[PDB]
């Protein structure tokens, strides 16, 4: 199972880890992708997860969008986890660099409550432009299921743990 995580709360755990390497190691039931509404996995966590699937995640995602249309900001969809997980929960957090409402971050985290255990990144963090300290606070105050957070950057991981109230 998950190893080397620091326990933040009853149900939230955190580790300084590459979420692709973590997923390939654990092969969790659910890996969360930091998706956009179009499921265009170009960069950040989405680009890294997609590249690990040899683009199979993008091929599957384009078929999903062709059939269903784009997701909503704050929404999600369950697709295959390919070689990384049983399932991938593609969750759209608000992209602050697109003027999207930061209040949608709580709605985005609510998607995690439909899964008993998840491997996930901090939503809206990184290239999505939100404050990762704020994302972690919304995560612990919204998610009730067991969430194992992988934070890629060591310096950000240390800042998140040392400032966690
Ligand atoms: C290649 C790459 O984008 N690496 C990662 C970035 C972030 Br943010 C999270 N996890 C990663 O594995």
Atom of ligand 1 nearest to the CA of 125: 8
- Three-state secondary-structure class, residue 141: helix
Q: Is 48 a pocket residue for ligand 1 (Cβ < 6 Å)? A: yes
> For residues 17 and 40, is the Cβ–Cβ distance under 8 A?
no
Breaks (C-N over 2.5 A) in the chain follow: none
The protein residue with its alpha carbon nearest to ligand 1, atom 2, reads 48
3-class DSSP state of 13: strand
Question: In angstroms, what is the resolution?
Answer: 1.1
Assess whether the C-beta atom of 45 lies below 6 angstroms from ligand 1. yes
- Contact at 8 Å (CB) between 124 and 105? yes
| 8 Å CB contact between 135 and 105 | yes
At what angle are helices 154-163 and 132-142 packed, to 10 degrees? Answer: 60
Strand partners, 14: 6, 149
Q: Where are the domains of the chain?
A: 1-165
Give the integer Cα–Cα distance in Å for 132 and 138: 10
Contact 97, 128 (CB under 8 A): yes
Q: Which helix (H) or strand (E) holds 78?
A: strand 76-80
Nearest-angstrom CA–CA distance, 132 and 68? 31
Cβ neighbors of 57 (< 8 A, separation 6 or more) are 33, 41, 49, 50, 79, 80, 82, 88
* Cβ neighbours of 4 (radius 10 Å): 9
φ, ψ of residue 151 to 5 degrees: the values are -110, 115
Question: Following CA atoms 53, 51, 123, 148 in sequence, which dihedral angle do they give, to the nearest 10 degrees?
Answer: 50
User: Edge-to-edge strands of the sheet including 87-92?
Assistant: 6-7, 12-16, 146-151, 117-120, 30-35, 87-92, 76-80
> Distance, CA 150 to ligand 1 centroid (Å)?
10
Enumerate the β-bridge partners of residue 153. Answer: none
Contact 3, 22 (CB under 8 A): no
Q: Is 163 helix (H, G, I), strand (E, B) or coil?
A: helix
Experimental method: X-ray
Token representation of residue 92: 């759209």
Nearest to 10 by CA among 144, 135, 120: 144
The Cα 157–Cα 136 span in angstroms is: 11
User: What span, in angstroms and rounded, lies between the C-alpha atoms of 135 and 47?
Assistant: 20
CA atoms within 13 A on the CB side of 12: 22
């Amino acid at each position: 199972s998950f190893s080397g995580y620091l326990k933040l709360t009853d149900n939230v755990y955190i580790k300084n880890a590459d979420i692709v390497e973590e997923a390939k190691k654990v092969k969790p039931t659910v890996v969360v992708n930091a998706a956009n509404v179009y499921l265009k996995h170009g960069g950040g966590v989405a680009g890294a997860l997609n590249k690990a699937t040899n683009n199979a995640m993008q091929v599957e995602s384009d078929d999903y969008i062709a059939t269903n249309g784009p997701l909503k900001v704050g929404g999600s969809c369950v697709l295959s986890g390919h070689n990384l997980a049983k399932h991938c929960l593609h969750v759209v957090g608000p992209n602050v660099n697109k003027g999207e409402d930061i209040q949608l971050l709580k709605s985005a985290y609510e998607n995690f409550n439909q899964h008993e255990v998840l491997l996930a990144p901090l939503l809206s963090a990184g290239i999505f432009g939100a404050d990762p300290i704020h994302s972690l606070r919304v995560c612990v105050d919204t998610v009730r299921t067991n969430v194992y957070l992988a934070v890629f950057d060591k310096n950000l991981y240390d800042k998140l743990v040392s400032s966690f109230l």
